[PDB]
């Protein structure tokens, strides 16, 4: 069988982290329009049968803490896991309201040996954030 088993009692969780306002001490601008995405994703994934949880303006600490607790949950009856991050960022980084957080850190909570109840199950990370400062001028 070359297709993930998506017939578990539940599709699984869909954690949406939407960061719009950032501490002045960061110099990050307010991400106007992000709420539209958040609400959009909530409806989309509800239609897909995912247990959606929205979390707004979280500090780096709050992000790591949240992701760590989600990974410690029992996903035995869940077919998969979805995490959406909406914020500013750099390559391999997403910003909490008060500072940078390396993506590898929150992703590791869910790696095979780390999250037993998700082992062998699809783990999706949808990321809306910058990965640098290069601009694509396009062609043709």
């Amino acid at each position: 069988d070359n297709s993930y088993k998506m017939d578990y009692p539940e599709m699984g969780l869909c954690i949406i982290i939407n960061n719009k306002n950032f501490h002045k001490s960061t110099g990050m601008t307010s991400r106007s329009g992000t709420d539209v995405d958040a609400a959009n994703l909530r409806e989309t994934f509800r239609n897909l049968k995912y247990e959606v949880r929205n979390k707004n303006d979280l500090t780096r600490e709050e992000i790591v803490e949240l992701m760590r607790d989600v990974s410690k949950e029992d996903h035995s009856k869940r077919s998969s896991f979805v995490c959406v991050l909406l914020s500013h960022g750099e390559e391999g980084i997403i910003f909490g309201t008060n500072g940078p957080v390396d993506l590898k850190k929150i992703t590791n909570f869910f790696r095979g040996d780390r999250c037993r109840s998700l082992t062998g199950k699809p783990k999706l990370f949808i990321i809306q954030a910058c990965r640098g400062t290069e601009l694509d001028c396009g062609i043709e």
């Binding site: 989309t44 809306q128 990965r131």
Partner: protein
């Protein structure tokens, strides 16, 4: 025994090293494209093909408009990164 990095999928809104665009009233180009694509095809297409459609929608239907020449008429291409072991269907 399987890799601990297996079965992960990262749907990046933009290519490595690049900026990612967001519209003040509609939201980010990538998220609005992803939602719209999931709406039309989540009941038909395998996830990778849906994300490819997202890549095409963002790359073709969007361009930046800014009074600032530096950020004007810019384009964007999303980046699908899959360590998945099987095909994924939302049904």
């Amino acid at each position: 025994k399987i890799p601990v990095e297996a079965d992960f999928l990262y749907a990046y809104s933009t290519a490595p090293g690049y900026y990612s665009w967001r519209n003040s009233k509609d939201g980010s180009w990538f998220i609005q494209s992803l939602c719209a694509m999931l709406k039309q095809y989540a009941d038909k297409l395998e996830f990778m093909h849906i994300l490819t459609r997202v890549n095409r929608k963002v790359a073709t239907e969007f361009e930046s408009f800014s009074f600032d020449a530096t950020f004007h008429a810019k384009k964007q291409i999303p980046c699908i990164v899959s360590m998945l072991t099987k095909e994924l269907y939302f049904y």
